[PDB]
Coordinates of all heavy atoms in Angstrom, one line a residue:
Chain N
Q366 N 36.4 17.7 -19.1 CA 35.9 17.4 -17.8 C 34.6 18.0 -17.5 O 34.3 19.1 -18.0 CB 36.8 17.9 -16.7 CG 38.3 17.5 -16.9 CD 39.1 17.7 -15.6 OE1 38.7 18.5 -14.8 NE2 40.2 17.0 -15.5
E367 N 33.7 17.2 -16.8 CA 32.5 17.8 -16.2 C 32.3 17.6 -14.8 O 31.3 18.0 -14.3 CB 31.3 17.2 -17.1 CG 31.2 17.7 -18.5 CD 31.0 19.2 -18.6 OE1 30.5 19.8 -17.6 OE2 31.4 19.8 -19.7
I368 N 33.2 16.9 -14.2 CA 33.2 16.7 -12.7 C 34.5 17.2 -12.1 O 35.5 16.7 -12.3 CB 33.0 15.2 -12.4 CG1 31.6 14.7 -12.9 CG2 33.1 15.0 -10.9 CD1 31.4 13.3 -12.6
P369 N 34.4 18.3 -11.3 CA 35.6 19.0 -10.8 C 36.4 18.2 -9.8 O 36.3 18.4 -8.6 CB 35.1 20.3 -10.3 CG 33.7 20.0 -9.8 CD 33.2 19.0 -10.8
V370 N 37.2 17.3 -10.3 CA 38.1 16.5 -9.5 C 39.5 16.7 -9.9 O 39.9 16.5 -11.1 CB 37.8 15.0 -9.4 CG1 38.7 14.3 -8.5 CG2 36.3 14.7 -9.1
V371 N 40.4 17.2 -9.0 CA 41.8 17.5 -9.4 C 42.5 16.2 -9.5 O 42.6 15.4 -8.6 CB 42.4 18.4 -8.3 CG1 43.9 18.2 -8.3 CG2 42.2 19.9 -8.6
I372 N 43.1 16.1 -10.7 CA 43.9 14.9 -11.0 C 45.3 15.1 -10.4 O 45.7 16.2 -10.2 CB 43.9 14.6 -12.5 CG1 45.0 15.5 -13.2 CG2 42.6 14.8 -13.1 CD1 45.2 15.2 -14.7
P373 N 46.1 14.0 -10.2 CA 47.5 14.2 -9.8 C 48.3 15.0 -10.7 O 49.4 15.4 -10.4 CB 48.0 12.8 -9.6 CG 46.8 12.0 -9.4 CD 45.8 12.6 -10.3
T374 N 47.9 15.2 -12.0 CA 48.6 15.8 -13.0 C 49.9 15.1 -13.4 O 50.8 15.7 -14.1 CB 48.9 17.4 -12.8 OG1 48.0 17.8 -11.8 CG2 48.7 18.2 -14.0
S375 N 50.2 13.9 -12.8 CA 51.2 13.1 -13.2 C 51.0 12.1 -14.3 O 51.8 11.3 -14.6 CB 51.7 12.3 -11.9 OG 51.9 13.2 -10.8
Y376 N 49.8 12.2 -14.9 CA 49.4 11.4 -16.0 C 50.3 11.7 -17.2 O 50.1 12.6 -18.0 CB 48.0 11.6 -16.5 CG 47.0 10.7 -15.7 CD1 47.4 10.1 -14.5 CD2 45.7 10.7 -16.1 CE1 46.4 9.4 -13.8 CE2 44.8 10.0 -15.4 CZ 45.1 9.3 -14.3 OH 44.2 8.6 -13.5
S377 N 51.4 10.9 -17.4 CA 52.3 11.0 -18.6 C 52.4 9.6 -19.1 O 53.4 8.9 -18.9 CB 53.7 11.6 -18.2 OG 54.4 10.6 -17.4
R378 N 51.3 9.2 -19.8 CA 51.1 7.8 -20.2 C 51.2 6.9 -19.0 O 51.2 5.6 -19.1 CB 52.2 7.4 -21.3 CG 52.0 8.1 -22.6 CD 53.1 7.8 -23.5 NE 53.0 8.5 -24.8 CZ 53.9 8.4 -25.8 NH1 55.0 7.7 -25.5 NH2 53.8 9.0 -26.9
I379 N 51.3 7.4 -17.8 CA 51.2 6.6 -16.6 C 49.8 6.1 -16.6 O 48.8 6.8 -16.8 CB 51.6 7.3 -15.3 CG1 50.5 8.3 -14.9 CG2 52.9 8.0 -15.6 CD1 50.5 8.7 -13.5
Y380 N 49.6 4.8 -16.3 CA 48.3 4.1 -16.6 C 47.9 4.2 -18.0 O 46.8 3.8 -18.3 CB 47.2 4.7 -15.6 CG 46.2 3.6 -15.2 CD1 46.7 2.3 -15.2 CD2 44.9 3.9 -14.8 CE1 45.8 1.3 -14.8 CE2 44.1 2.9 -14.5 CZ 44.5 1.6 -14.5 OH 43.7 0.5 -14.1
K381 N 48.7 4.7 -18.8 CA 48.6 4.6 -20.3 C 47.2 5.1 -20.7 O 46.4 4.4 -21.2 CB 48.7 3.1 -20.7 CG 50.1 2.5 -20.5 CD 50.2 2.0 -19.1 CE 49.4 0.7 -18.9 NZ 49.4 0.1 -17.6
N382 N 47.1 6.5 -20.6 CA 45.8 7.1 -20.7 C 44.9 6.6 -21.8 O 43.7 6.7 -21.7 CB 46.0 8.6 -20.9 CG 46.9 9.3 -19.9 OD1 48.1 9.3 -20.0 ND2 46.3 9.8 -18.8
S383 N 45.5 6.0 -22.9 CA 44.7 5.3 -23.9 C 44.1 4.0 -23.4 O 43.0 3.6 -23.6 CB 45.5 5.1 -25.1 OG 46.5 6.1 -25.3
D384 N 44.9 3.2 -22.6 CA 44.5 2.0 -22.0 C 43.3 2.3 -21.0 O 42.5 1.3 -20.9 CB 45.6 1.3 -21.2 CG 46.6 0.6 -22.0 OD1 46.3 0.6 -23.2 OD2 47.6 0.1 -21.5
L385 N 43.1 3.4 -20.5 CA 41.9 3.8 -19.8 C 40.7 3.5 -20.6 O 39.8 2.7 -20.2 CB 41.9 5.2 -19.4 CG 42.4 5.5 -18.0 CD1 41.8 4.5 -17.0 CD2 43.9 5.5 -17.9
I386 N 40.6 4.1 -21.8 CA 39.4 3.9 -22.6 C 39.3 2.5 -23.2 O 38.2 2.0 -23.4 CB 39.2 5.0 -23.6 CG1 37.8 5.1 -24.1 CG2 40.2 4.8 -24.7 CD1 37.6 6.1 -25.2
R387 N 40.5 1.9 -23.4 CA 40.5 0.5 -23.9 C 39.8 -0.4 -23.0 O 38.9 -1.1 -23.3 CB 41.9 0.1 -24.3 CG 42.0 -0.3 -25.8 CD 43.4 -0.8 -26.1 NE 44.4 0.0 -25.4 CZ 45.2 1.0 -26.0 NH1 45.1 1.1 -27.4 NH2 46.0 1.7 -25.3
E388 N 40.3 -0.4 -21.7 CA 39.8 -1.3 -20.7 C 38.3 -0.9 -20.2 O 37.5 -1.7 -19.9 CB 40.7 -1.3 -19.5 CG 40.2 -2.2 -18.4 CD 40.3 -3.6 -18.6 OE1 41.1 -4.0 -19.5 OE2 39.7 -4.5 -17.9
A389 N 38.0 0.5 -20.3 CA 36.7 0.9 -20.0 C 35.7 0.3 -21.1 O 34.7 -0.2 -20.7 CB 36.7 2.4 -20.1
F390 N 36.0 0.4 -22.3 CA 35.2 -0.2 -23.3 C 35.1 -1.7 -23.2 O 34.0 -2.3 -23.4 CB 35.6 0.2 -24.7 CG 35.0 1.6 -25.1 CD1 35.8 2.5 -25.7 CD2 33.7 1.9 -24.9 CE1 35.2 3.8 -26.1 CE2 33.1 3.1 -25.2 CZ 33.9 4.1 -25.8
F391 N 36.2 -2.3 -22.9 CA 36.3 -3.8 -22.5 C 35.1 -4.1 -21.5 O 34.2 -4.9 -21.8 CB 37.6 -4.1 -21.8 CG 38.6 -4.7 -22.7 CD1 39.6 -4.0 -23.2 CD2 38.5 -6.0 -23.1 CE1 40.6 -4.6 -24.0 CE2 39.4 -6.6 -24.0 CZ 40.5 -5.9 -24.4
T392 N 35.2 -3.4 -20.4 CA 34.2 -3.8 -19.3 C 32.8 -3.4 -19.6 O 31.8 -4.1 -19.2 CB 34.7 -3.2 -17.9 OG1 36.1 -3.1 -17.9 CG2 34.2 -4.1 -16.8
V393 N 32.6 -2.3 -20.4 CA 31.3 -1.8 -20.7 C 30.6 -2.8 -21.7 O 29.5 -3.1 -21.5 CB 31.4 -0.4 -21.3 CG1 30.1 -0.1 -22.0 CG2 31.7 0.6 -20.2
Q394 N 31.4 -3.2 -22.7 CA 30.7 -4.0 -23.7 C 30.7 -5.5 -23.3 O 29.8 -6.3 -23.8 CB 31.4 -3.9 -25.0 CG 31.5 -2.4 -25.5 CD 32.3 -2.2 -26.7 OE1 33.3 -2.9 -26.9 NE2 31.9 -1.2 -27.5
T395 N 31.5 -5.9 -22.4 CA 31.5 -7.3 -21.9 C 30.4 -7.5 -20.9 O 29.6 -8.5 -21.1 CB 32.8 -7.7 -21.3 OG1 33.2 -6.6 -20.4 CG2 33.9 -7.9 -22.3
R396 N 30.2 -6.7 -19.9 CA 29.3 -7.0 -18.8 C 27.9 -6.8 -19.2 O 27.5 -5.9 -20.0 CB 29.7 -6.0 -17.7 CG 28.7 -6.2 -16.5 CD 28.8 -5.0 -15.6 NE 28.3 -3.8 -16.2 CZ 28.0 -2.6 -15.6 NH1 28.3 -2.5 -14.3 NH2 27.6 -1.6 -16.2
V397 N 27.1 -7.8 -18.8 CA 25.6 -7.8 -19.0 C 24.9 -8.3 -17.8 O 25.4 -9.3 -17.1 CB 25.3 -8.7 -20.2 CG1 26.4 -9.7 -20.5 CG2 24.0 -9.4 -20.0

Side-chain angles (χ1 to χ4, degrees):
Chain N
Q366 309 194 338
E367 291 298 336
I368 295 181
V370 183
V371 151
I372 79 173
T374 339
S375 304
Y376 277 9
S377 69
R378 291 173 183 177
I379 76 158
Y380 214 25
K381 298 89 66 180
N382 305 86
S383 331
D384 281 355
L385 262 318
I386 198 182
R387 238 181 318 254
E388 179 74 18
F390 275 136
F391 262 105
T392 330
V393 164
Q394 302 174 330
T395 46
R396 177 197 65 170
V397 22

